[PDB]
């Protein structure tokens, strides 16, 4: 066996970014990529409107904040069910950040996914945020499981 | 039937006509649960074969809007 390759589509006129393209690929339901594209466009527009700054930098800072450095992987060595901290590769970090962003944004609850994602990007740029709660919990678990930094 | 006209069996209609030309009389037995009730059915205590017996039923005025099967149950419990 072994790993496998893959690729995506970068070009996006509204805040061109490969991570933005990956996010667009995410949050998509029922094969409706157009809905996700429109939602992301309108959310970035609302961000640019409310905050006098380019949404690209805000999104980058939100990703830098939510990205988890250490992952806590379970492992059952005997009747103990231990856990092992793990160093997350940048790809897995970005994917986990996207997952948490989307999930907690849709979990927040507002009148529109656009406003939900906008407020989530804001509460991510400002470390105080839902996805950052998940980040902090994961970091706490990794710290508590530091005893198994390496087998 | 929507505009082709109401529905009734020929033999049952002939029996009812023979019975009504002079006066309404003894039950008119028939197996035609399909037949729809007409104003002529009024006064005639028709019988319907529910599968094992004939149930005589007195057809009143308001019965015109139903079928004999509506008054002839079949399932048992």
């Amino acid at each position: 066996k072994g790993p496998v390759a893959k690729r995506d589509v970068l070009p996006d006129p509204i805040y061109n970014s490969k991570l933005v393209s990956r996010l667009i690929n995410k949050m998509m339901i029922d094969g409706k990529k157009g809905k996700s594209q429109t939602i992301l466009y309108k959310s970035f527009d609302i961000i640019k409107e409310r905050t006098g700054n380019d949404a690209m930098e805000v999104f980058e800072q939100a990703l830098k904040n939510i990205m988890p450095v250490l992952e806590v992987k379970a492992r059952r060595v005997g009747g103990a069910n231990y856990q092992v901290p793990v160093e997350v590769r940048p790809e897995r970090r970005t994917t986990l950040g996207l997952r948490w962003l989307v999930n907690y944004a849709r979990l927040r609850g507002e009148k529109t996914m656009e406003e939900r994602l906008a407020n989530e990007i804001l509460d991510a740029a400002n470390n105080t945020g839902a996805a950052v709660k998940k980040r902090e919990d994961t970091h706490k678990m990794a710290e508590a499981n530091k005893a198994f930094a390496h087998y | 039937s929507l505009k082709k006209g109401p529905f009734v069996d020929g033999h049952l209609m002939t029996k009812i006509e023979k019975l009504n030309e002079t006066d309404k009389k003894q039950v008119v037995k028939t197996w035609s649960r399909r037949s729809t009730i007409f104003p002529q059915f009024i006064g005639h205590t028709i019988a319907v074969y529910d599968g094992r017996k004939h149930v005589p039923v007195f057809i009143s005025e308001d019965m015109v809007g139903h079928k004999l099967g509506e008054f002839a149950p079949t399932r048992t419990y």
Binding site: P11, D12, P13 | -
Partner: protein, 103 residues
């Protein structure tokens, strides 16, 4: 009259790259007349931007079959194929894209 076929997911782009100014006809329609959501319009010209062929060839196509996205993909694929068959000088550059998927 350079010709090409942008076969992609049942959507065929009967493209004939003839020398023109840069007009792109889709089933006898205009770009905006046919395809809203211009996010894909800029993508169609991806190879047209990789190689400088801005306004020297016209694109007359009769795209039959497929949705909007599949039609745009077939259009750009046929454009790339016809452009390569016309001038293979930049085939070394366009081999890193290909756009052939057998979808």
């Amino acid at each position: 009259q350079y010709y090409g076929t942008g076969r992609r997911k049942s959507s065929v782009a009967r493209v004939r790259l003839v020398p023109g100014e840069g007009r792109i006809v889709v089933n006898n329609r205009e770009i905006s007349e046919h395809i809203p959501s211009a996010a894909l319009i800029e993508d169609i010209k991806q190879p047209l931007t990789l190689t400088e062929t801005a306004g020297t060839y016209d694109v007359l196509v009769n795209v039959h079959g497929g949705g909007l996205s599949g039609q745009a993909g077939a259009i750009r694929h046929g454009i790339a194929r016809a452009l390569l068959e016309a001038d293979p000088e930049y085939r070394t550059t366009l081999k890193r894209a290909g756009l052939l998927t057998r979808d």
